[PDB]
Amino acid sequence: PGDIPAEDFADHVRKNERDSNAGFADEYQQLSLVGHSQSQMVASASENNAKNRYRNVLPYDWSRVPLKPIHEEPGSDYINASFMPGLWSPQEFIATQGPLPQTVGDFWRLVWEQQSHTLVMLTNCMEAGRVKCEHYWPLDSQPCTHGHLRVTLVGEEVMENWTVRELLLLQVEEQKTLSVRQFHYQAWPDHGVPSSPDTLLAFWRMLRQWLDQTMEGGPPIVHSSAGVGRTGTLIALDVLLRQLQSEGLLGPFSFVRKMRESRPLMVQTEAQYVFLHQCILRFLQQS
């Protein structure tokens, strides 16, 4: 179904790189046509005006992740977040924007209601003086509370290009806790690419090693600033590398197309689309 056999992928990438990525640019032009005739009426509602970081980056109605409604609060079921397809499921991941000050509580409610044990953060809170995402997790000195939830920082290990944080999410009305592990990649510029495929692959190997041991609960929640660009590139990397290993096939164009049906702008620059292919190529060279 358009899938490329593993043995054929290296040649496919080289063909699309010719003439300054002439083949990749045409594939990206075709991908940019996908999914625009779908409604965004919930995200566009006046009640939800202050809940979207970017007016022109909104979830589609059919694939948005609803929150449980709060009695007499219109729009309380809305968060800028979408179910994203994976290897096995159309709900394998959740892509969401970087929380705003006024949606940090909704974000943690999303984590709780989905029972997601894994967060992936691909943005810094501020980049070159420009705000990208709220620092939505607590410091180790004081837990933070939102609605019926208490969030506690339990541990934090800092590496050269990423940080892993261990969090405890307690729903006070239920007396039930959720352990959440946050994988924060700290060297991926907005609308750009990491410095090399090797460092992103190292981050991915760590994340996938964790996920292959943590499959209880809901989908991993992946986010950046808009929740489309760095988010879509990482999700595509993980799905395609697992497709490579579990099926011996790779279908990047097909997967990004499915992603665009669920949420706009996934893999947000042509450079990120090319970078995605160069990472898979490096994973084969490393193999």
UniProtKB/Swiss-Prot annotation:
Tyrosine-protein phosphatase domain ranges (all copies): 24-283
Cytoplasmic side: 1-287
Induction: Induced at the early stage of hepatocellular carcinoma and is suppressed at later stages.
Location of the protein in the cell: Cell projection, Microvillus membrane; Apical cell membrane; Cytoplasm
Tissue: Expressed at high levels in the brain, spleen and liver and at lower levels in the heart and stomach. Expressed in pancreatic and colorectal cancer cells, but not in normal pancreas or colon. Expression in hepatocellular carcinoma is related to the differentiation status of the tumor and expression is inversely related to tumor aggressiveness.
Active site residues of this protein: S224
Assembly mode: Homodimer; disulfide-linked. Interacts with LCK. Interacts (phosphorylated form) with GRB2 (via SH2 domain). Interacts (phosphorylated form) with FYN (via SH2 domain). Interacts (via extracellular domain) with CEACAM20 (via extracellular domain); the interaction dephosphorylates CEACAM20.
Family recorded in the similarity comment: Belongs to the protein-tyrosine phosphatase family. Receptor class 3 subfamily.
Protein purpose: Protein phosphatase that may contribute to contact inhibition of cell growth and motility by mediating the dephosphorylation of focal adhesion-associated substrates and thus negatively regulating integrin-promoted signaling processes. Induces apoptotic cell death by at least two distinct mechanisms: inhibition of cell survival signaling mediated by PI 3-kinase, Akt, and ILK and activation of a caspase-dependent proapoptotic pathway. Inhibits the basal activity of LCK and its activation in response to TCR stimulation and TCR-induced activation of MAP kinase and surface expression of CD69.
Domain note: The extracellular domain mediates homodimerization. One or more cysteines in the extracellular domain is essential for the formation of dimers probably by forming a disulfide bond.
Name the UniProt record assigns to this protein: Receptor-type tyrosine-protein phosphatase H
Species in which this protein is naturally found: Homo sapiens (Human)
Designated gene of the protein: PTPRH
